[PDB]
Write a protein that binds this ligand. Structure first.
Ligand SMILES: COc1ccc2nc(N)sc2c1
Ligand SMILES: [Zn+2]
Ligand SMILES: [Zn+2]
Length: 85
């Protein structure tokens, strides 16, 4: 991989789930280093309007917000994660 993970500092390879901090620092992170669920990653990364912000740093989601929003979506309590911005 070209980029190192914002959290653990090890390389991000193409076969690992990874998310870019587009809110600001523009660093790539392994999904598993952030604590983001597989569910949130799937929903966040497909949603063109949403961006992710790392713990140090168009609708912005932190990990915990993305996690909480996806749980609500999947329980049928919200229409998309954008509702949680
Ligand atoms: C290792 O330091 C970080 C920096 C940013 C960050 N963002 C997260 N969601 S976990 C995390 C950990
Ligand atoms: Zn990492
Ligand atoms: Zn950041």
């Amino acid at each position: 991989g070209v980029y190192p993970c914002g959290a653990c500092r090890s390389e991000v390879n193409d076969d690992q789930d990874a998310i870019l901090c587009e809110a600001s620092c523009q660093k790539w992170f392994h999904r598993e280093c952030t604590g983001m669920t597989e569910s949130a990653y799937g929903l966040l990364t497909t949603e063109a309007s949403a961006v992710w912000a790392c713990d140090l740093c168009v609708y912005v989601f932190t990990t915990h917000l993305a996690n909480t929003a996806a749980e609500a979506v999947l329980q049928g309590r919200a229409d998309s994660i954008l509702a949680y911005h």
